[PDB]
Amino acid sequence: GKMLKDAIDKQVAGALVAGTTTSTHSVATDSTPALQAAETGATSTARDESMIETRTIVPTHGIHETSVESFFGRSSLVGMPLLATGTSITHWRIDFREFVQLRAKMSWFTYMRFDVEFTIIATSSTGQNVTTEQHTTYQVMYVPPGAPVPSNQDSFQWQSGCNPSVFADTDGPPAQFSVPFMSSANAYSTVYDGYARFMDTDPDRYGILPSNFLGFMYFRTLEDAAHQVRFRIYAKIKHTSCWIPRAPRQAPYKKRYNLVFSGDSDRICSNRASLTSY
Amino acid sequence: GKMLKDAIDKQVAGALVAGTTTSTHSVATDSTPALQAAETGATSTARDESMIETRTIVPTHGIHETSVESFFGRSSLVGMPLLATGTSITHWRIDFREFVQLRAKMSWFTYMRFDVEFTIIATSSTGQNVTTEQHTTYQVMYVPPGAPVPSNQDSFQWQSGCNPSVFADTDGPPAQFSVPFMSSANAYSTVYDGYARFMDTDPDRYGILPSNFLGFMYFRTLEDAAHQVRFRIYAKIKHTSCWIPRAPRQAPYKKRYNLVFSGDSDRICSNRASLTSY
Amino acid sequence: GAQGGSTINYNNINYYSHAASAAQNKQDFTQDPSKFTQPIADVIKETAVPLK
Amino acid sequence: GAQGGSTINYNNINYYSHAASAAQNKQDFTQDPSKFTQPIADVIKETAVPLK
Amino acid sequence: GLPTKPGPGSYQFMTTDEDCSPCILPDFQPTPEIFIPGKVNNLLEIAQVESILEANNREGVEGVERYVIPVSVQDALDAQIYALRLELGGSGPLSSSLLGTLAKHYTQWSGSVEITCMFTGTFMTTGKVLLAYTPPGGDMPRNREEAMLGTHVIWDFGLQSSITLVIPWISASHFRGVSNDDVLNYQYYAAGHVTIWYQTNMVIPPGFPNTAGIIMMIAAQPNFSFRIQKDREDMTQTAILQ
Amino acid sequence: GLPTKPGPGSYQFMTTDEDCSPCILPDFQPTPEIFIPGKVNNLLEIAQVESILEANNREGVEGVERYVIPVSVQDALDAQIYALRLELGGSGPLSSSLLGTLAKHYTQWSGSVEITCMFTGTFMTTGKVLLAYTPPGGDMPRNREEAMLGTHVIWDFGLQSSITLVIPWISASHFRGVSNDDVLNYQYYAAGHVTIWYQTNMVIPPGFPNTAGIIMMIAAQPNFSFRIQKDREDMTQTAILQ
Amino acid sequence: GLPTKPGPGSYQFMTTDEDCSPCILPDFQPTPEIFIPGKVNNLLEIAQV
Amino acid sequence: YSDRVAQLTLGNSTITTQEAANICVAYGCWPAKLSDTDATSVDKPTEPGVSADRFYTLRSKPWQADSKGWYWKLPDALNNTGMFGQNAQFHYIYRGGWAVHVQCNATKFHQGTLLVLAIPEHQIATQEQPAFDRTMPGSEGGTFQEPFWLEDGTSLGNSLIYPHQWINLRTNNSATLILPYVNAIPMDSAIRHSNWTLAIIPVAPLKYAAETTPLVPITVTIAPMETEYNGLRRAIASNQ
Amino acid sequence: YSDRVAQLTLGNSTITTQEAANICVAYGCWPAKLSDTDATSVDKPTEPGVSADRFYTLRSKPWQADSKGWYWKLPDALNNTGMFGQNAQFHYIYRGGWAVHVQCNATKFHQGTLLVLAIPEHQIATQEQPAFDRTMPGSEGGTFQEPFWLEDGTSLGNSLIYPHQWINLRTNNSATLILPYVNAIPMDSAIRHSNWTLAIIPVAPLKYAAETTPLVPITVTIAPMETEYNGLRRAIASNQ
Ligand SMILES: CCCCCCCCCCCCCC(=O)O
Ligand SMILES: CCCCCCCCCCCCCC(=O)O
Ligand SMILES: CCCCCCCCCCCCCC(=O)O
Ligand SMILES: CCCCCCCCCCCCCC(=O)O
């Protein structure tokens, strides 16, 4: 049926890399492809065929593993809240900045528009952190800014009449759910050269764009936990638009909410004793 | 096939918000859009374009998250009966008034016609309420008004020849089932300015419309429970018709079966010291 | 719907017999705000004076 | 696609209502490298001298 | 049997699931739908209805009187009548209105808002009032000279009892955050100021009441919307209701 | 119910799964996409942009100066300016460039690379330089006589400040390994050598700076690609960021 | 295998379920239906007596 | 041309006002008779016509300095009045709409504002569940004690969602509301259930150009509209 | 025929250079006005035209032997200058592109190379989160302390991904960049957010054919392009 045709999108990865045309020797004063001028800011236009004698090469290699979708389109850890047994409650602030691998991958772009698939793995363990048996339901509640936060395991906030929740078992399959692009802005921002507030220039609000922050995930067990639970929160970025590539992060990350780095030794690649030998 | 076409309904959320037409300055005695009269009971008709000079704005925002279906169309807690080990039996009276979030959401309307998806999460725990292991079947029996109630775990009422029952495991996936609009009336009523009975004006039967009450859910374990079981009963309202919007509840709820409130301090929003500063 | 902008387009497929089993309806239905905003016998056009 | 060479050919089938539920997009989209490599008002053909 | 691979998310219960589920009473045939007046299909039909601002929120004012802003005969020129931070969230006067109480259920908002004011003085009582909307970036306007630089209407008391100041959607972004969540710096979404000033003065015949009132009313324009349902802050319970 | 047989891989979570999954907010309607300049659809658009080699990686050179290879007036003929092992992996100068940092995320590479050199001496400073690419099998070329036997360009300093040596894809196989993993003998994928020599000499007018610089720049050609994502070696953490 | 997501209500037994289920005697061929007087299709035929 | 001048003629009765605002027609729905598709009761209804579809005037109320407001249940307030009252007493079930007219004149030397609410299904409470003398107060009506909370734990400010007009003394001396039948069933008992509440709440207090405060009454006039009755038996006056 | 000679005329102002390289147009995108499909703010924008779309010259900088570099935030650097500055002060939100022209002449007896970066959303840090005097330095601009790390934990070598030119003294004395508006929203506040940073970093140091080092200034000239402003109120100068 055509109605089911609406739920199917045929999508194709068949873009190839550029090929090579055979070329011959050139002795002239007409064509000088090797002479360049980096001052313009343009990258060199010279190609293989104009610099040496080439054979013909039919293109066969795909480019799809470096499409922005493929590069971001896998799951990565973004949150690891620990539910202790004293209160049986925990939360994770929602952003991709606690764990460095996804953050550094995002640092190649300025603005990014995407959806998210979240995946939550819960693991129970003892005080000495050895795996242990515990079968219990847990509740993950999305708490958006301005909604009252639960303060206990039995708080009546966990009613969840308006906050969305997911209920799953600690020893069941992983909870998984998708999320549309939720920013009030038309993209997310990986970096922000401004202040979070008018009438304020506190350093702690520099580089803080609050339209990236959609709130909190809160976690309880539905009864009081017998053992601590660790939730691992994975995000896969999908349906991805990217704008304005950047110099990628090179210094290690130090803080969650700013770009501070050490910068004690100004170098990235390793040293050698002489430029004319390895 | 066309027969399977009967089981598919293509349904679309593409209603947009109103746009903006550009306007220019107006110097006249003809058109006075800013002059109003609130005495009529009509809301102001003045629009942006007639009050200031506007640009053109193409509408892009949807309205679907405030459709009545979307606003009610999620699950909320409505019942939390506890099955103790002494009798291994409990029940929940069926109405959406024990827990305040769903009740307050319903208080925006007078009459509401809907279906229900119920979801039941069972959790076992110790006397000190710490999660514990217990694998057992439980039985939820719909007991409508006039059907004899079970008095024990082994009562022969649990035969369930005519009452519908659901059997599920305490440590299995949650039981879930749907329900059509069951009122003898043509809608449910969120508020009732009348008496439950003729020839009676007892205050305890004021505001009681018994056509909202479809009876009881009764709960046993199929054997005698070793640990207490807590059932959490969630309802999602769906296929929703709503009539006659109301002033929504503002004072906290106090009782399950009437609108009594404290009303000690007559205000809702917070105070300030002066109307001409914040 | 593999996407238009703010158009969610859904094929609700009910697997059970009773219509009550079906998932929630995603249609946008007609809005008549004026039964609540302009609930008056005589229409008052925006550019007119309301009284008289 | 039971295989052409470097052509992955996929029918993304979304079972849920919201487009955000769909799996990741496998299309190759247009590449315009020259907005970054040749970001200059006057085109400089390869065989010409760049300055002047 | 058809070979399958159940994946992640198996057996979870999400409260916003949109799935069909077996009916426990598959033979039931409900009562017909009858005509009832006032069917609502979308809560933005309610948000476009005017409601009264709890505008006189001064410490010590209780009850119905919180709905009338005082307006008096002034002995000095260009005085201020009222000041209000434009906010759908928080706990100020807009928060308890129809639009404000709907905004309590939502995280984000967009669109134009209108404020309709009704004067309640005697027939013989005259006056002119300046109603100003100041876009964000600074503080509340300090004097009528500064406030007039913004969007503003000038109200003449007369036969038509009421005025509208349309607060237009003026915004860097398509949407703002409803809340003012501090830890999350949602003051980023500061939406400006509404102030009311005496444009001339309130003038009365000898021995008339030297004080009258404005009843402020607010509603959403047709270009308004809400996103992201969220729990209402002030609808709580400490126990199951009995 | 339809008879089924769930098979192996049931309930597993693979990080590269391509599956639809229920949306926790199925009624949400996002903000429109606006025009933004510089949309990127494929990271090989970035790899074709020239970036500066951290080429002066001698022990003791810090900061911006690591970006300028010294070039001097020579007192002897046919001297060597620079030597560089052609490697997208490891930790040598190519590893910190745009192409090198992208290669840190990938396991395999193919295609031609180009190196653009810009001379920074005074207008009056002259010179001719030989830039050589030696295919693998042996060591770095020891003298300009040996290096010239390979692919090479000869650069005349003049008005056009810059030159390109195209390092063409010359390879037994369609792809090479990015890394030089020793236990796995990925030195199998040795990709050759780049060396720079004085073709004549740097010559200056009396009392000019006798030392100038080359800024080396590198980028991928349009026939280039990467395979197999892999973790970046030098982007680590010992603790969760707070 | 076809990727699936079993949801809530998995493995429950509802007494009013309307589902097909495997027949323990799939080759059985019942006796024909004969005519009997007084066939009842709906209990409201009894209620009208 | 003038929505400040109105005339309302029902039966043998006619109202006029020279200072109206307009006429509020609740939910844009004029009262209408019950169609065969929504009806359930099989007996042929009695439709009394002009004998009941006419304006009835209740006793007037003084607007005092301290007044919190007044309220009337419908049909409750008219259940003992005229042929409407008799038809409502003699039948088990009733249906119909209302034409409500609130009168209050004062001077150009007065100020003050009344809010005139028609509230459907206005179930009331306070710190306690209310007794019968407040839920069904009869022709004399009741008084608010929590006008800020609209006697129901909601707020007066948000009650503009209900059909309403104002009486602002500088502008008008009368409010008119036309109310359709509202219920979740087709017909319902007149003695057991109140479909509408007429509520008149002072918002801006009543002030005079002197300190001597003459008598300013409020007067309610209500006409039933498009009435039907089913279930004829003896006459029953109240649910007690 | 000659991309070494350029003339730039905006408003009442005209720049010339006899040693340009070319003109960099960032992302191949000429500045453009906001279309009705992407716009959200409903008020009619003010477009000041030539009163603001003109070249402004900042104070010059000496290129010294030790110089690490200089930077300016935009619109920050021009927020107190001319009718651009006034339109940016008096409106809540602003949008527009830039025409940037960096001048530095020296002799055929000099050597040295400047890198001229236009960096969008250039959020900066060092071992510490920066203060306001560095995030929004004004017309005088700021200076780099970590030019190798591009003040942001990235690398200067990879910043050629950003729109750029060089000033290599043997080749050219000037760099020209045309910048489109870049943001994740349609308009944004001029005092709270800097959309672009103009960064001028010495890569090859400045050397003279003698040991006596005369003064070689760097001079920045910036023209706003295709500007709009919405949200008129009083004038607000800074985010402090
Ligand atoms: C739990 C359902 C709603 C949660 C919304 C999650 C959306 C996350 C998007 C994060 C984008 C900003 C990333 C960042 O600031 O580093
Ligand atoms: C268990 C199967 C039959 C149960 C029927 C449940 C229907 C519940 C509808 C409740 C509507 C009235 C809500 C209320 O009174 O507050
Ligand atoms: C077992 C029979 C398979 C039929 C289900 C096909 C997929 C469901 C249709 C979903 C339609 C809306 C999806 C969308 O376009 O957003
Ligand atoms: C339950 C409905 C069954 C429909 C699923 C049919 C198989 C999925 C289509 C996969 C299309 C791409 C596969 C390929 O050719 O590589």
Side-chain angles (χ1 to χ4, degrees), chain C residues 2-24:
Chain C
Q3 285 155 239
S6 290
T7 303
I8 307 163
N9 184 302
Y10 178 41
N11 294 291
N12 196 303
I13 297 192
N14 183 16
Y15 290 114
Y16 307 94
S17 65
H18 206 295
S21 285
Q24 43 274 53

Side-chain angles (χ1 to χ4, degrees), chain A residues 43 47 50 63-64 238-239, chain D residues 22 27-28 31 37-38 46:
Chain A
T43 290
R47 50 209 186 94
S50 75
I63 68 185
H64 192 73
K238 51 178 186 169
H239 321 125
Chain D
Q27 196 60 41
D28 278 319
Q31 291 181 201
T37 55
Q38 301 309 303
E46 181 207 36

Side-chain angles (χ1 to χ4, degrees), chain B residues 61-78:
Chain B
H61 307 157
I63 68 185
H64 192 73
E65 275 167 285
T66 52
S67 84
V68 285
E69 194 91 5
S70 183
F71 177 76
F72 291 103
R74 55 192 52 195
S75 307
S76 169
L77 189 75
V78 291

Side-chain angles (χ1 to χ4, degrees), chain H residues 16-40:
Chain H
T16 63
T17 169
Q18 308 205 48
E19 312 177 29
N22 204 311
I23 307 178
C24 180
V25 188
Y27 315 117
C29 272
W30 281 85
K33 263 151 171 53
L34 182 73
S35 75
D36 299 324
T37 55
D38 300 346
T40 188

